[PDB]
Design a binder for these strands. Structure first.
Length: 132
DNA sequence: GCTAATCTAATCAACCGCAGGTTGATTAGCCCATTAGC
């Protein structure tokens, strides 16, 4: 079981396209401001930006056009989330039982450890690809 | 089918120390990443 997917509104899509036409690689500041402006969480904005970059690269692949890429100085990234030893131990205990936790498991871990669900999913994806 | 959510692999970068391991954050995926709600 995974997360229930998101459904877009016309104004949300217009804002997403208007923000992507200016900068296809937005920092955490622009992503959070746009998410605050459209009524969806910032992880959803980041996921949509990644998927839009993937589709634009695929489209430049279809049309055999070169992709511009990084233009201008890169914006600031998200500040690294500090995870304590207790939260790390709890995440390791949950990782031994299930390597691929569902949406309910991630929500429960977020309500417990206090870390965002997106950060817990990032930690799980980094832990699966580093501890066989 | 369309596209968000998810996975893995590779890589950049903060952290702590005063060098380079460790782990979180970012990006790309090339019989055009895969899988599953809408």
């Amino acid at each position: 079981g995974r997360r229930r997917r998101l459904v877009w509104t016309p104004s949300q899509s217009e804002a997403l396209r208007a923000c992507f036409e200016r900068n296809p690689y937005p920092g955490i500041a622009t992503r959070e401001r746009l998410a605050q402006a459209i009524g969806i969480p910032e992880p959803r904005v980041q996921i949509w930006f990644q998927n839009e970059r993937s589709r634009q690269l695929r489209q430049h692949r279809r049309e055999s056009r070169p992709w511009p890429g990084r233009r201008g100085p890169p914006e600031g990234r998200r500040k690294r989330t500090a995870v304590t030893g207790s939260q790390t131990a709890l995440l390791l205990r949950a990782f031994e039982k299930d390597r691929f936790p569902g949406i309910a498991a991630r929500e429960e871990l977020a309500r417990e450890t206090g870390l965002p669900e997106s950060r817990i999913q990032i930690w799980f994806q980094n832990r699966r690809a580093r501890h066989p």
